[PDB]
C-alpha cells in the first residue's frame, strides 16, 4: 500500500516547518516506521528540567491504527510504569485517524502536567498524587534529577 | 504551488444564490450540502421546508433542525475575498454605534 509511509512522511515535513514546543520526533534511523522522540519536562510540573526519551512504532495501517508509544526514560508518574508504558486514552480506545504524532506528544506533555490518578498504571503513585501532592512533587522531582538530567 | 486566479472565476463558489452576494455566516443544509448566508436561509426556511436550489425537503416539520453553521466554508470566503471580512465587521460596528 505505501499509504502509511506517505502519511508518516508528511507529518515529518510539518514537524520540520513547525517544530512542536518542548519536544521533537523523527526516524531513529532508516526505517520511517520506527521513530524516537524527546520531551522536555513541562515547567508546570515536577519534571521540569528533565529530558525524557520515547520510542515510536507506527503500524502498517497507520493512521487508522494508533502508533505504539513508550518512554525509555525512567519516570515517576501515575500513568506511566517502569516499562515506560503509557496509559493514555488516545493511544488505545480514543484514537482518531485525524491525530498526529505532534498531537500525541502534546497530549503526553499535558499528561505530565496533570496526571490522571483515576486510571492508574501505578496505583501507589496515583494514591500519593491524590492524598499528598507535596510528597508526589518531591519524589517526582528527585527521580527527574536522578534519571532525566 | 502559488497560483493566481481571477476573482470572477472563484465567485460562483463563494456566492449565496438567495441574496446574490458573498456568503456571510455560511450555513449549510445537511440534507443536500447546499449553502447560504445564515440570514438568507433562516428567513427563507420560515415559509418553505425545501431547499431553494435542489428542492429536496430539509425536514418534515422543522427545517432549522437540519442546517448547520459552515465554519470551513465561511473561513474560505473570508480568506479569498480581499477586504470582505473587514467590511462586514465595520458594517456591524457602524451599526452598533447607531443603535
Amino acid at each position: 500500500l505505501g499509504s502509511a509511509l506517505k502519511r508518516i512522511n508528511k507529518e515529518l515535513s510539518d514537524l520540520a516547518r513547525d517544530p512542536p514546543a518542548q519536544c521533537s520526533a523523527g526516524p531513529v534511523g532508516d526505517d520511517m516506521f520506527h521513530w524516537q522522540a524527546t520531551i522536555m519536562g513541562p515547567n508546570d510540573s515536577p519534571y521540569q528540567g528533565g529530558v525524557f526519551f520515547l520510542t515510536i512504532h507506527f503500524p502498517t495501517d497507520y493512521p487508522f491504527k494508533p502508533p505504539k508509544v513508550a518512554f525509555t526514560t525512567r519516570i515517576y508518574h501515575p500513568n506511566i510504569n517502569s516499562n515506560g508504558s503509557i496509559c493514555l486514552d488516545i493511544l488505545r480506545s480514543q484514537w482518531s485517524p485525524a491525530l498526529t504524532i505532534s498531537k500525541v506528544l502534546l497530549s503526553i506533555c499535558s499528561l505530565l502536567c496533570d496526571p490522571n490518578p483515576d486510571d492508574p498504571l501505578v496505583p501507589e503513585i496515583a494514591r500519593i498524587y491524590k492524598t499528598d501532592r507535596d510528597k508526589y512533587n518531591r519524589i517526582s522531582r528527585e527521580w527527574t534529577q536522578k534519571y532525566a538530567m | 504551488r502559488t497560483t493566481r486566479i481571477k476573482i470572477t472565476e472563484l465567485n460562483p463558489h463563494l456566492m449565496c444564490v438567495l441574496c446574490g452576494g458573498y456568503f456571510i455566516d455560511a450555513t449549510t443544509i445537511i440534507e443536500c450540502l447546499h449553502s447560504f448566508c445564515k440570514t438568507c436561509i433562516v428567513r427563507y426556511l420560515e415559509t418553505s421546508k425545501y431547499c431553494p436550489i435542489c428542492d429536496v425537503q430539509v425536514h418534515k416539520t422543522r427545517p432549522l433542525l437540519n442546517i448547520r453553521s459552515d465554519k470551513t466554508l465561511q473561513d474560505i470566503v473570508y480568506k479569498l475575498v480581499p477586504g470582505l471580512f473587514k467590511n462586514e465587521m465595520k458594517r456591524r460596528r457602524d451599526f452598533y454605534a447607531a443603535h
Binding site: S3, K6, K10, E11, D14, D61, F64, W95, S96, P97, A98, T100 | R1, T2, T3, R4, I5, K6, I7, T8, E9, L10, N11, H13, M15, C19, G20, G21, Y22, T28, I30, E31, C32, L33, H34, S35, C37, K38, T39, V42, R43, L64, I67, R68, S69, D70, K71, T72, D75, I76, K79, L80, V81, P82, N87, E88, R91, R92, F95, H99
Partner: protein, 101 residues
Amino acid sequence: TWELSLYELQRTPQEAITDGLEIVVSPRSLHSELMCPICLDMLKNTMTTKECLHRFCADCIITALRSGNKECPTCRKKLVSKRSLRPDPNFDALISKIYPS
C-alpha cells in the same frame, strides 16, 4: 437557537467583485480548509459529515469507518455509517477550480 440579531434582521448583501482582480493564493492560504485531516493530503472525492460538516476524502473516511470507530475523526460525534456522510461535489469543484488535478 437561530434567532436573528438586530444587525442580522436588516443586513444587506456583500456585493460580488466583478473586475479583473486576481486573487493570490499562496500554498498555505487554504491549507487547513482544503486538507483531509486523515491522509493530510488535499481533499479528493470529498465526503462531508452531515452532523458537523467536516470533510474527508471518500476513501479515507470510508476506511476509518470500516476500521471500527464510529466517530467523526475531527470532533468525535456519533457516525452511524456511510449514510451519516454526504458526497460534497461543490467542495470538489472549488478545489478543481483552484488546483486542477
